[PDB]
Amino acid sequence: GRIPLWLVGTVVGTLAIGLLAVFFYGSYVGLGSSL
Amino acid sequence: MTSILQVALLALIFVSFALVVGVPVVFATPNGWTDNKGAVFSGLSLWLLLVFVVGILNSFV
Amino acid sequence: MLTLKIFVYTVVTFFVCLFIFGFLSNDPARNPGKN
Amino acid sequence: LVDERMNGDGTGRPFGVNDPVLGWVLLGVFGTMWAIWFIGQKDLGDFEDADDGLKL
Amino acid sequence: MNIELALTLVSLVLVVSAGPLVVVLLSARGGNL
Amino acid sequence: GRDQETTGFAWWSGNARLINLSGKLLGAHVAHAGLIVFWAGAMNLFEVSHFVPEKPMYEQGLILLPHIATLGYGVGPGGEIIDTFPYFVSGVLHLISSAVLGFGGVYHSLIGPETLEESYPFFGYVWKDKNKMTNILGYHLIMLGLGAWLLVWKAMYFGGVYDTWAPGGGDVRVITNPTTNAAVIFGYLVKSPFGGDGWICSVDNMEDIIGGHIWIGTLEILGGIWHIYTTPWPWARRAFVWSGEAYLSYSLGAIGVMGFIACCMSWFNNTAYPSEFYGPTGPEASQSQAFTFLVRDQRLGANVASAQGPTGLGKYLMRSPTGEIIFGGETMRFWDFRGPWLEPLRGPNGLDLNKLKNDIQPWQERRAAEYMTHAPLGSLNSVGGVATEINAVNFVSPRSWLACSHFCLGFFFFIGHLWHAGRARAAAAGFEKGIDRFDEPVLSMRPL
Amino acid sequence: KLPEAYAPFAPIVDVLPVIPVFFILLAFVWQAAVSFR
Amino acid sequence: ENSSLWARFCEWITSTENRLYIGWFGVIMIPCLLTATSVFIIAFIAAPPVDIDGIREPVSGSLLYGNNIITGAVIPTSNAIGLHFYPIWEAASLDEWLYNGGPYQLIVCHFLLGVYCYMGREWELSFRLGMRPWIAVAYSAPVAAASAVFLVYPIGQGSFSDGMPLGISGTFNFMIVFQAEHNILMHPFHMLGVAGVFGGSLFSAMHGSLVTSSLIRETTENESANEGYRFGQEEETYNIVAAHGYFGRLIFQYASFNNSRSLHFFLAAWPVIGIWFTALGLSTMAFNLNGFNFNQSVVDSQGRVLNTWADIINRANLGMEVMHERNAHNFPLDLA
Amino acid sequence: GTYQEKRTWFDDADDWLRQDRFVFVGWSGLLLFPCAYFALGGWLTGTTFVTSWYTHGLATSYLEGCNFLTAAVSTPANSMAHSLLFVWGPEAQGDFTRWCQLGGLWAFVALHGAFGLIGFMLRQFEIARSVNLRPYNAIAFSAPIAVFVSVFLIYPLGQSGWFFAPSFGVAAIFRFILFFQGFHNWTLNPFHMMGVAGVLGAALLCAIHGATVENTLFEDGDGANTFRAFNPTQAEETYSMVTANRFWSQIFGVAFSNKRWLHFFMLLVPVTGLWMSAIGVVGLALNLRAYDFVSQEIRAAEDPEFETFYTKNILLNEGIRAWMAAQDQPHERLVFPEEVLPRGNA
Ligand SMILES: CCCCCCCCCCCCCCCCCC(=O)OC[C@H](CO[C@@H]1O[C@H](CO[C@H]2O[C@H](CO)[C@H](O)[C@H](O)[C@H]2O)[C@H](O)[C@H](O)[C@H]1O)OC(=O)CCCCCCCCCCCCCCCCC
Ligand code: CLA
Ligand code: CLA
Ligand code: CLA
Ligand SMILES: CC1=C(/C=C/C(C)=C/C=C/C(C)=C/C=C/C=C(C)/C=C/C=C(C)/C=C/C2=C(C)CCCC2(C)C)C(C)(C)CCC1
Ligand SMILES: CC1=C(/C=C/C(C)=C/C=C/C(C)=C/C=C/C=C(C)/C=C/C=C(C)/C=C/C2=C(C)CCCC2(C)C)C(C)(C)CCC1
Ligand SMILES: CC1=C(/C=C/C(C)=C/C=C/C(C)=C/C=C/C=C(C)/C=C/C=C(C)/C=C/C2=C(C)CCCC2(C)C)C(C)(C)CCC1
Ligand SMILES: CC1=C(/C=C/C(C)=C/C=C/C(C)=C/C=C/C=C(C)/C=C/C=C(C)/C=C/C2=C(C)CCCC2(C)C)C(C)(C)CCC1
Ligand code: OEX
Ligand SMILES: [Cl-]
Ligand SMILES: [Fe+2]
């Protein structure tokens, strides 16, 4: 194929673990933040 | 002598970011170490230069 | 109760010494493998 | 002193021995099991050698 | 929005970029990894 | 790199390919040795960067600063802080020095010779060469024996360390007279590990902690030279397995036990882990409750000796099962406690009634009031009470982080022991691949 | 806190502890680059 | 022959011809388990009632004292003893040993030493037959779990009274008091272990169904299907391609194992890793690192607090916090 | 067949339905796929946006601050108590946004989940008949259906409401579990004591058989990656049933000798466990619970010296009932003085 698969999963896998950090960040701030 | 130190210490991070990235590229290329042998020695020694240079003027700050 | 404490020490250090002097007696050649 | 006991739990005596008969019990049983092992060492192979273990 | 929280996250982008950049530069140029 | 069809090892058991490759393996340990120093420097600067030197150190979620502060850098009487520049230096020192280890870890792992056997003969080793292993053992016993002396020299010449048993709140003390009596030193090792005895966690003074390191400094230099000039004896040839993985699993059995001891020493020992810096222990915070709530009857004047509880046992003070005057309640299980804020209140017969009603310093209750609040029991999202405690405060003790982390870290290495010590015993015998299907032993045995 | 000649570098030092976790993630990136040979 | 007395002895312990293998772990496993078994039976039948909490209210645990099988227990060591090594000889009279929580600490010390070494001889026989050695690893998952409820948890609490009793109703009190103090259900290690056995039972029901459902026709219909297998045979007793072909149609083709050696590893690795976290769960909860706590966490504007389910589980825990050890707590915190 | 009957439209439809594909549809796919898709999609909708503030009086969504652990599709209130809560029915009357507010999205998930589980079990029948196998995979999946039907349907149809059903959320299960300890003493029902032995017993057969096979393998390759050496069409087996017998015969005392009986034993132990625990929930649905032992409640009544851990458990069940039931059952409108609830001291 055109694009190598290994930097497809790196970019998606970074943006998934980048996405998870928001939900941990949103756990201490905003709603449900216990303050 | 604060701003003398801060420009010297921003200079360190730029050199270190070169040496973190470029130095494994120098090794893992075919014959890249026989070619850039003296090139890396410039970049390594300039790292060793600045770390004492930042280290000495801490007594002056 | 001292008569009982001198008996446990004979029992334990008997079985502890069968352990220690048992594994020294060329246990790694007590295998069905061949060379 | 209603009763007589050991009085030896918080003392920190070495190996828990407080009567010196226990040290001879600790050592005399040890030397006897060693003595039977040392005699029977004649059957366990003679590895007086440069390198003769279970090597790989 | 702070200047401290922003430059921290700018600092994290540069390091995370520097990881695969060593892999990309050898997957293209050298081919010995 | 390599491939699977030349070694039979997949991408996930890939570091086992470089067993017989001496040179790559040397770069593998140096690179990993960089990351330990690199974590040491980065986490130190990170904790200095978020450090408020007026609040107590254990309140701010800190584990590496009290290690440096126990040695006595920038600290004064009572556990205060003088200056935080030496905490900045070691984070800087490890972080720059990690790059020096970092370059050597990159170099030998890529370009340096993959087997340093025939080119560099002093460094080349075969895993069955017993004399060479006892050399490489015996060199590092010196490097690990000399490192024991640095703590001794710093406690006897270079300012000393934080002695929390000094009178009137602990401070930095040069230990002039180390206790080096062999009957005193080796009494800890052959002591039972149960309650009231406490195998090596119960070393209670600074006089022994550096007093012991004179022994282990001397022995590891005497033992290091011993293994250089000698080979293992023929009983040690009849006892051990002499492969590469076998040497690893011997180590994994050791540092599994190392983790369980540091698991227990950071939970119980308030001498090497002083309570001013790491926070109080569990037994200290529980005994702090009954002491401070015995001050809360002296302001009202009721008799603490005659205060009978609901079960007829004594609300405040009762008797030990070895006959000593101790506290009461559910904290009767912690009567083996000793602490520098409470040991000046004890006589022969435990703590004295006449001394407790009259001879209380003001700083002793002030320290024993922080230790009621900052008990180590917390939660996982750092709430910090009992499980029936609402989201109010944000604290959980570093003693509870160190005891939980180094239990689990020091547990899987015992599972690491049982993996490799079985595999190294199997592969030295021959049948690590499986059953032969032609000449196998169970078909050649009697039934039952 | 940091010394005053060093205080403009607090945002960089709050990244530094997370770096060794990214080394084990790099080793899976590199093995995907060789496509798990 | 010319063999010594000792070599005659070592060619009997390591002899595999015995009905039950002994080995060198079994020379100290067998006298520890037979110790711990024979004292467990007596204290389950004839133990006088034990002061468990130190408040001198003895708790009954014997069948001869009006208990049945479910309410029988071997009561833990008293609170006043704590972690002091309390063997039989430190007590003055033998009845002083029994009243203070004697046979709990005698069993647990011989039990835990016995099951560390039952793991040992599972290695040792596997070296004596040429097997690969990792069954002893898989037995460490319950051994990690049983070391925690008997030894690692009384250390962090400081007393063997908070350990788990040796009884069926004794266990059920230990489950309740634990979650009241530590909230085990809101800890991700108990969540892994719960998935370790719900996944573990699913992976046994599913694997064991498909092997039965692909058996080759070799018997009649009056005869049982187990008679098609004769012992020690070489040829395979069930079609393997048919079961991957079935299970490939069932969800999708990538969701299956065609390699049966990769299959049986997954069946071993799933519960064993799962029990390791729930063994380390209450190991870390022994040192008072409880779990999650979302009490008073969802709030709106104007400073009011909305209930969640986590506030309902609070009320269960708060109703059990103020009821366990009912005559012990003289002070408004449960530090011990 | 074999007499040349003609083909009808139903016959033509069957070939498309039982055509091999990346996902098998079949005839059961008409019952499975639109009933399974709306179940979990109705779960993700309710846990994300839909409140529970009117039913129980507590927030349950990500749009309210509840995280993954504390979000739940909550049961309806005890006002309805047995209605099916149709979106057209008299408790809702067509209005969707008021239908969710009465907790009716619970019954949308529970009822569409039940017809999913019928359809998924029917899926395992027609795939097995297509490949001509034996139906034992279908027979094992009845035990998850008996747990589902008894706990989520038979139990509220015996109690006073759908309110006392479990809610489809993580922490909402955790009160339903804690409901059964105080109010039922569910840990002393032997039908649950046989449920545990099925669960923990099947977890043990998953760990031994997976490790006995893996350690008695036949050396067939030369690389030490022993997963590479398995051609799955080979006629011989991959491990040694003789050696594996003699290991556990001398370690444990008795071992298997029959590879056919073994995997069937791994079938029987978890299935019997759940089926013997679906019976215990049936007794709880009528409140025929094994709460008490009579001959020890009498003895503890007359004597303040006798106790066991059993009598220590009856006090803890009183601590669950007299404390959480103020908020757990808000339809009972009850309040408590702080003197009427049982405590210890301090
Ligand atoms: C409050 C305090 C309580 C204190 C309690 C006491 C605790 C004590 C703890 C000690 C722990 C040590 C345990 C490990 C010991 C390892 C011994 C060993 O691996 O041993 C291995 C070596 C092997 O030795 C070699 O053994 C060889 C055997 O050869 C024989 O066998 C060869 C082939 O096998 C050939 O065939 C050859 O022909 C044949 O002669 C040769 O003899 C060699 O010369 C010889 O060097 O043994 C040796 O060196 C052993 C050297 C050390 C011996 C120590 C003995 C101590 C005795 C103390 C006093 C006891 C009194 C007993 C009284 C009994 C009656 C009441
Ligand atoms: C810290 C852990 C660690 C370390 C030090 C090593 C080290 C090594 N591994 Mg192992 N490995 C690891 C973890 C580790 N591994 C893990 C977690 C896995 C599982 C995914 C593997 C799986 C694995 C396999 C399957 C193989 C190795 C192999 C190797 C060796 C050569 C790699 C190579 O050819 O480089 C080539 C790689 C590159 C050029 C990619 C770039 C790598 C550079 C070094 C990263 C630079 C990092 C940093 C920014 C540099 C800072 C600059 C510094 C100068 C200051 C090397 C000794 C190979 C082997 O067997 O050797 C014989 C091999 O086949 N490894
Ligand atoms: C961690 C570092 C280290 C390592 C890995 C080794 C490893 C080894 N050593 Mg070395 N050694 C070391 C440190 C080390 N040693 C030091 C520091 C010393 C100086 C004391 C020695 C002195 C030494 C000698 C003299 C010999 C070895 C030998 C050996 C080999 C076999 C050991 C054995 O069978 O143990 C198995 C363990 C036992 C059999 C039991 C040991 C338990 C001891 C006795 C502890 C008990 C002490 C006790 C607390 C004191 C009681 C006091 C009381 C009376 C109050 C092995 C290669 C032997 C060898 O092969 O020769 C080259 C050998 O003869 N070592
Ligand atoms: C085949 C798959 C399937 C199945 C089994 C169900 C089953 C169910 N759904 Mg779900 N549903 C489905 C597909 C399915 N649905 C689809 C595709 C959608 C999207 C449009 C929905 C959307 C949906 C909603 C929004 C709701 C349901 C509801 C229900 C329940 C009520 C059943 C009912 O009253 O029907 C009654 C009708 C029949 C059983 C059909 C019988 C056939 C008749 C007898 C033939 C005669 C017709 C004849 C012409 C009539 C003449 C009348 C004339 C005199 C005027 C039940 C559990 C309700 C629910 O969950 O309860 C809370 C609800 O609110 N469903
Ligand atoms: C000291 C310092 C420095 C340095 C640093 C460093 C050294 C860094 C490194 C870094 C790195 C080195 C990083 C890395 C990264 C990487 C990553 C982050 C990745 C990720 C990935 C993922 C996440 C994914 C994965 C995957 C794949 C690919 C396949 C398999 C599967 C999966 C999906 C999992 C500098 C100079 C800057 C300056 C400052 C200071
Ligand atoms: C072999 C290999 C590997 C590994 C590698 C490694 C591991 C490496 C390491 C490396 C390293 C280990 C590195 C390090 C580095 C470091 C550095 C480079 C540092 C720097 C520093 C700095 C720059 C500083 C700065 C500063 C100062 C001065 C102070 C404060 C402030 C600041 C921060 C600014 C892997 C796994 C991938 C696999 C493949 C191959
Ligand atoms: C500084 C310090 C100190 C001291 C310390 C010390 C001095 C230590 C030492 C230690 C030691 C000195 C130890 C030792 C140990 C030993 C061991 C641990 C052994 C082991 C053994 C083994 C392992 C063997 C095995 C075997 C058997 C059983 C049989 C046959 C086979 C074999 C040989 C393998 C003190 C406390 C004062 C204070 C604190 C700190
Ligand atoms: C009710 C209703 C309905 C239905 C609807 C539906 C069916 C919907 C669906 C929906 C859906 C279908 C949804 C989905 C969702 C999903 C989600 C929301 C996900 C999430 C996830 C997360 C958050 C995480 C992720 C992850 C993981 C898994 C781990 C690792 C990391 C990551 C990140 C990757 C109907 C029409 C019938 C009627 C009307 C109403
Ligand atoms: O000991 Mn069985 O549970 Ca550990 O908290 Mn206090 O003490 Mn008793 O209460 Mn809660
Ligand atoms: Cl208390
Ligand atoms: Fe199987």
mmCIF file of all heavy atoms in Angstrom, chain C residues 1-3 5-6 9, chain D residues 6-8 11 13-26, chain H residues 90:
data_model
loop_
_atom_site.group_PDB
_atom_site.id
_atom_site.type_symbol
_atom_site.label_atom_id
_atom_site.label_comp_id
_atom_site.label_asym_id
_atom_site.label_seq_id
_atom_site.Cartn_x
_atom_site.Cartn_y
_atom_site.Cartn_z
ATOM 1 N N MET C 1 7.623 -26.387 80.082
ATOM 2 C CA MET C 1 7.545 -26.013 78.680
ATOM 3 C C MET C 1 8.910 -25.977 78.026
ATOM 4 O O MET C 1 9.010 -25.961 76.805
ATOM 5 C CB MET C 1 6.863 -24.658 78.520
ATOM 6 C CG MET C 1 5.366 -24.694 78.708
ATOM 7 S SD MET C 1 4.572 -25.650 77.404
ATOM 8 C CE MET C 1 2.874 -25.646 77.960
ATOM 9 N N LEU C 2 9.968 -25.959 78.838
ATOM 10 C CA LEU C 2 11.308 -26.000 78.274
ATOM 11 C C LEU C 2 11.591 -27.346 77.635
ATOM 12 O O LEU C 2 12.301 -27.416 76.628
ATOM 13 C CB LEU C 2 12.340 -25.677 79.351
ATOM 14 C CG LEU C 2 13.806 -25.682 78.931
ATOM 15 C CD1 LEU C 2 14.024 -24.729 77.786
ATOM 16 C CD2 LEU C 2 14.673 -25.293 80.095
ATOM 17 N N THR C 3 10.998 -28.411 78.172
ATOM 18 C CA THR C 3 11.142 -29.736 77.588
ATOM 19 C C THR C 3 10.500 -29.807 76.209
ATOM 20 O O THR C 3 10.962 -30.551 75.340
ATOM 21 C CB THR C 3 10.520 -30.760 78.533
ATOM 22 O OG1 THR C 3 11.048 -30.556 79.847
ATOM 23 C CG2 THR C 3 10.852 -32.179 78.114
ATOM 24 N N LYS C 5 10.240 -27.014 74.173
ATOM 25 C CA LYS C 5 10.996 -26.142 73.285
ATOM 26 C C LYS C 5 12.300 -26.789 72.839
ATOM 27 O O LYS C 5 12.742 -26.561 71.709
ATOM 28 C CB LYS C 5 11.265 -24.794 73.956
ATOM 29 C CG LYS C 5 11.909 -23.765 73.043
ATOM 30 C CD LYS C 5 12.095 -22.431 73.715
ATOM 31 C CE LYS C 5 12.733 -21.451 72.763
ATOM 32 N NZ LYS C 5 12.925 -20.113 73.373
ATOM 33 N N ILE C 6 12.908 -27.639 73.671
ATOM 34 C CA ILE C 6 14.095 -28.348 73.199
ATOM 35 C C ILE C 6 13.749 -29.460 72.231
ATOM 36 O O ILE C 6 14.647 -29.999 71.581
ATOM 37 C CB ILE C 6 14.962 -29.011 74.287
ATOM 38 C CG1 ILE C 6 14.274 -30.217 74.897
ATOM 39 C CG2 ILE C 6 15.278 -28.050 75.392
ATOM 40 C CD1 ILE C 6 15.200 -31.038 75.748
ATOM 41 N N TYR C 9 13.131 -27.678 68.515
ATOM 42 C CA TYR C 9 14.405 -27.337 67.896
ATOM 43 C C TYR C 9 15.130 -28.562 67.353
ATOM 44 O O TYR C 9 15.842 -28.455 66.352
ATOM 45 C CB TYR C 9 15.301 -26.602 68.885
ATOM 46 C CG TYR C 9 14.938 -25.156 69.125
ATOM 47 C CD1 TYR C 9 15.655 -24.396 70.024
ATOM 48 C CD2 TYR C 9 13.941 -24.533 68.400
ATOM 49 C CE1 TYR C 9 15.358 -23.074 70.233
ATOM 50 C CE2 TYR C 9 13.633 -23.212 68.617
ATOM 51 C CZ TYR C 9 14.351 -22.489 69.523
ATOM 52 O OH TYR C 9 14.048 -21.168 69.726
ATOM 53 N N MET D 6 8.185 -18.513 80.438
ATOM 54 C CA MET D 6 9.446 -18.221 79.774
ATOM 55 C C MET D 6 9.936 -16.804 79.989
ATOM 56 O O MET D 6 11.112 -16.628 80.311
ATOM 57 C CB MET D 6 9.335 -18.451 78.263
ATOM 58 C CG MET D 6 9.239 -19.894 77.819
ATOM 59 S SD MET D 6 10.743 -20.814 78.152
ATOM 60 C CE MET D 6 10.239 -22.452 77.658
ATOM 61 N N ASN D 7 9.059 -15.815 79.820
ATOM 62 C CA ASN D 7 9.399 -14.391 79.737
ATOM 63 C C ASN D 7 10.461 -14.151 78.670
ATOM 64 O O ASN D 7 11.548 -13.639 78.934
ATOM 65 C CB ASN D 7 9.856 -13.830 81.083
ATOM 66 C CG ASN D 7 8.743 -13.739 82.082
ATOM 67 O OD1 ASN D 7 7.640 -13.305 81.761
ATOM 68 N ND2 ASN D 7 9.019 -14.157 83.309
ATOM 69 N N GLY D 8 10.140 -14.556 77.449
ATOM 70 C CA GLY D 8 11.131 -14.460 76.401
ATOM 71 C C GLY D 8 10.640 -14.087 75.020
ATOM 72 O O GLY D 8 11.293 -14.443 74.038
ATOM 73 N N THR D 11 12.309 -10.280 74.084
ATOM 74 C CA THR D 11 13.682 -10.121 74.533
ATOM 75 C C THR D 11 14.676 -10.005 73.393
ATOM 76 O O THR D 11 15.740 -9.408 73.583
ATOM 77 C CB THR D 11 14.064 -11.294 75.425
ATOM 78 O OG1 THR D 11 13.929 -12.512 74.686
ATOM 79 C CG2 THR D 11 13.156 -11.342 76.632
ATOM 80 N N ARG D 13 16.393 -12.472 71.974
ATOM 81 C CA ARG D 13 17.516 -13.373 72.133
ATOM 82 C C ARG D 13 17.828 -14.028 70.791
ATOM 83 O O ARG D 13 16.910 -14.287 70.009
ATOM 84 C CB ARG D 13 17.195 -14.423 73.190
ATOM 85 C CG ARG D 13 16.973 -13.843 74.571
ATOM 86 C CD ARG D 13 18.256 -13.260 75.128
ATOM 87 N NE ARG D 13 19.278 -14.282 75.325
ATOM 88 C CZ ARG D 13 19.416 -14.998 76.436
ATOM 89 N NH1 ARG D 13 18.601 -14.800 77.461
ATOM 90 N NH2 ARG D 13 20.374 -15.910 76.526
ATOM 91 N N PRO D 14 19.103 -14.273 70.481
ATOM 92 C CA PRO D 14 19.470 -14.713 69.129
ATOM 93 C C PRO D 14 19.022 -16.138 68.868
ATOM 94 O O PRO D 14 19.159 -17.003 69.729
ATOM 95 C CB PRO D 14 20.993 -14.597 69.124
ATOM 96 C CG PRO D 14 21.372 -14.724 70.527
ATOM 97 C CD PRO D 14 20.293 -14.070 71.319
ATOM 98 N N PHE D 15 18.408 -16.351 67.700
ATOM 99 C CA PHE D 15 17.735 -17.594 67.302
ATOM 100 C C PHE D 15 16.649 -18.041 68.279
ATOM 101 O O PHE D 15 16.201 -19.183 68.216
ATOM 102 C CB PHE D 15 18.705 -18.762 67.110
ATOM 103 C CG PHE D 15 19.627 -18.618 65.957
ATOM 104 C CD1 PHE D 15 20.969 -18.387 66.159
ATOM 105 C CD2 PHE D 15 19.167 -18.783 64.669
ATOM 106 C CE1 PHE D 15 21.834 -18.284 65.096
ATOM 107 C CE2 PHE D 15 20.027 -18.673 63.603
ATOM 108 C CZ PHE D 15 21.360 -18.425 63.818
ATOM 109 N N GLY D 16 16.195 -17.177 69.181
ATOM 110 C CA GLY D 16 15.248 -17.585 70.188
ATOM 111 C C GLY D 16 15.802 -18.445 71.299
ATOM 112 O O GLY D 16 15.021 -18.965 72.096
ATOM 113 N N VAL D 17 17.118 -18.615 71.396
ATOM 114 C CA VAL D 17 17.670 -19.474 72.435
ATOM 115 C C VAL D 17 17.896 -18.647 73.694
ATOM 116 O O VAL D 17 18.279 -17.475 73.638
ATOM 117 C CB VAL D 17 18.953 -20.190 71.959
ATOM 118 C CG1 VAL D 17 18.683 -20.923 70.664
ATOM 119 C CG2 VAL D 17 20.144 -19.272 71.804
ATOM 120 N N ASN D 18 17.574 -19.235 74.839
ATOM 121 C CA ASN D 18 17.751 -18.545 76.109
ATOM 122 C C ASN D 18 18.473 -19.435 77.112
ATOM 123 O O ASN D 18 19.244 -18.954 77.946
ATOM 124 C CB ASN D 18 16.394 -18.077 76.637
ATOM 125 C CG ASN D 18 15.360 -19.183 76.662
ATOM 126 O OD1 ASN D 18 15.652 -20.335 76.351
ATOM 127 N ND2 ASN D 18 14.139 -18.836 77.032
ATOM 128 N N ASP D 19 18.233 -20.722 77.027
ATOM 129 C CA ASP D 19 18.983 -21.728 77.763
ATOM 130 C C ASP D 19 20.094 -22.245 76.866
ATOM 131 O O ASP D 19 19.825 -22.604 75.716
ATOM 132 C CB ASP D 19 18.066 -22.873 78.181
ATOM 133 C CG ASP D 19 18.693 -23.818 79.205
ATOM 134 O OD1 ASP D 19 19.856 -23.651 79.604
ATOM 135 O OD2 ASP D 19 17.993 -24.757 79.626
ATOM 136 N N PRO D 20 21.346 -22.280 77.332
ATOM 137 C CA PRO D 20 22.440 -22.758 76.472
ATOM 138 C C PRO D 20 22.356 -24.215 76.048
ATOM 139 O O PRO D 20 23.169 -24.620 75.213
ATOM 140 C CB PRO D 20 23.681 -22.504 77.327
ATOM 141 C CG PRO D 20 23.313 -21.321 78.118
ATOM 142 C CD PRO D 20 21.864 -21.471 78.446
ATOM 143 N N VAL D 21 21.413 -25.008 76.559
ATOM 144 C CA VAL D 21 21.194 -26.332 75.994
ATOM 145 C C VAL D 21 20.605 -26.227 74.592
ATOM 146 O O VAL D 21 20.840 -27.106 73.758
ATOM 147 C CB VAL D 21 20.323 -27.175 76.951
ATOM 148 C CG1 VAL D 21 18.919 -26.640 77.047
ATOM 149 C CG2 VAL D 21 20.316 -28.637 76.554
ATOM 150 N N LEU D 22 19.915 -25.127 74.283
ATOM 151 C CA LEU D 22 19.336 -24.948 72.960
ATOM 152 C C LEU D 22 20.404 -24.705 71.909
ATOM 153 O O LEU D 22 20.244 -25.122 70.760
ATOM 154 C CB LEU D 22 18.358 -23.786 72.981
ATOM 155 C CG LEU D 22 17.197 -23.979 73.940
ATOM 156 C CD1 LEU D 22 16.390 -22.715 74.036
ATOM 157 C CD2 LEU D 22 16.345 -25.114 73.468
ATOM 158 N N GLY D 23 21.490 -24.031 72.280
ATOM 159 C CA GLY D 23 22.579 -23.838 71.344
ATOM 160 C C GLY D 23 23.269 -25.138 70.987
ATOM 161 O O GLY D 23 23.641 -25.356 69.832
ATOM 162 N N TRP D 24 23.434 -26.027 71.966
ATOM 163 C CA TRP D 24 23.989 -27.335 71.655
ATOM 164 C C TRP D 24 22.995 -28.183 70.878
ATOM 165 O O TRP D 24 23.398 -29.033 70.084
ATOM 166 C CB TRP D 24 24.421 -28.047 72.930
ATOM 167 C CG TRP D 24 25.540 -27.350 73.616
ATOM 168 C CD1 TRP D 24 25.464 -26.592 74.740
ATOM 169 C CD2 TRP D 24 26.901 -27.300 73.191
ATOM 170 N NE1 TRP D 24 26.698 -26.086 75.056
ATOM 171 C CE2 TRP D 24 27.598 -26.507 74.115
ATOM 172 C CE3 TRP D 24 27.600 -27.856 72.117
ATOM 173 C CZ2 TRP D 24 28.956 -26.261 74.006
ATOM 174 C CZ3 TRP D 24 28.945 -27.607 72.010
ATOM 175 C CH2 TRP D 24 29.611 -26.818 72.947
ATOM 176 N N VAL D 25 21.700 -27.961 71.087
ATOM 177 C CA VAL D 25 20.686 -28.622 70.274
ATOM 178 C C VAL D 25 20.699 -28.076 68.854
ATOM 179 O O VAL D 25 20.601 -28.835 67.884
ATOM 180 C CB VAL D 25 19.315 -28.471 70.952
ATOM 181 C CG1 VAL D 25 18.193 -28.738 69.997
ATOM 182 C CG2 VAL D 25 19.220 -29.439 72.110
ATOM 183 N N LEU D 26 20.860 -26.761 68.709
ATOM 184 C CA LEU D 26 20.992 -26.160 67.385
ATOM 185 C C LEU D 26 22.251 -26.626 66.677
ATOM 186 O O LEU D 26 22.248 -26.823 65.458
ATOM 187 C CB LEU D 26 21.005 -24.638 67.492
ATOM 188 C CG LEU D 26 19.741 -23.840 67.197
ATOM 189 C CD1 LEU D 26 19.476 -23.914 65.724
ATOM 190 C CD2 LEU D 26 18.566 -24.386 67.941
ATOM 191 N N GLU H 90 5.497 -20.175 75.317
ATOM 192 C CA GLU H 90 5.520 -18.887 75.998
ATOM 193 C C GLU H 90 4.338 -18.730 76.936
ATOM 194 O O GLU H 90 4.418 -17.972 77.906
ATOM 195 C CB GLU H 90 5.550 -17.750 74.987
ATOM 196 C CG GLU H 90 6.892 -17.575 74.315
ATOM 197 C CD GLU H 90 7.937 -17.005 75.244
ATOM 198 O OE1 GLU H 90 7.569 -16.219 76.139
ATOM 199 O OE2 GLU H 90 9.128 -17.333 75.077
#
